[PDB]
Amino acid sequence: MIIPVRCFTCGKIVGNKWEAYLGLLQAEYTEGDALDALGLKRYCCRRMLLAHVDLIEKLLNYAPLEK
């Protein structure tokens, strides 16, 4: 739903890297080069960004119950 704060496997913070990752795929980095620019050197951290699905952006299409 939303980007995990930590890499499950090693505890590296990745919850501050998602918007930067998107802002590198725009400007035509490859996903590999984008992950390398973010310093995600272990495949267990790369797995976190490369496989994430940002479903919170869809959940925000629904209006809240209270105005």
Which positions make up the binding site?
Answer: 7, 10, 44-45
* Binding-site annotation, residues for Zn(2+): 7, 10, 44-45
Residues 6+ apart with CB under 8 A from 63: none
Task: Using alpha carbons, list the distances in angstroms from residue 35 to 7, 57, 59, 64, 67.
Answer: 14, 22, 26, 35, 39
Pick from 30, 42, 43, 53 the residue near other proteins by CB under 8 A: 42
Partner whose footprint covers residue 33, from other proteins, Zn ion, none (CB < 5 to 8 Å by kind): none
- Residue 22 in the binding site for other proteins (CB under 8 A): no
- Residue 7 in the binding site for Zn ion (CB under 5 A): yes
